[PDB]
């Protein structure tokens, strides 16, 4: 029981770094790559967990 609690209650802090695509776009990059990564990267950042649905079933 204690393991599951510590497992679920483990805190995650790693200083999620910010990406400056403009910097990489300027210094050097493959044409269409820096932009393709940005648009695809941003798309997944929008997705997030649905805490509401889980809150109800439990």
């Amino acid at each position: 029981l204690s393991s599951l609690v510590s497992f679920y209650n483990k805190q995650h802090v790693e200083q999620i770094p910010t990406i400056d695509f403009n910097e990489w776009k300027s210094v050097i990059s493959t044409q269409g790559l820096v932009d393709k990564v940005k648009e695809n990267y941003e798309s997944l950042i929008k997705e997030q967990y649905n805490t509401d649905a889980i809150s109800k079933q439990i």
């Binding site: 999620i16 997030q48 967990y49 805490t51 509401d52 809150s55």
Partner: peptide, 29 residues
């Protein structure tokens, strides 16, 4: 920015759980 989303979602689960207090009213009825 993810921390801002974390805190917002965090409070959501709290309010959703406290709603269980409404279920207690069902028993009284």
């Amino acid at each position: 920015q993810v921390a801002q989303a974390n805190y917002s979602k965090f409070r959501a689960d709290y309010s959703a759980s406290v709603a269980a207090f409404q279920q207690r009213i069902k028993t009284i009825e």
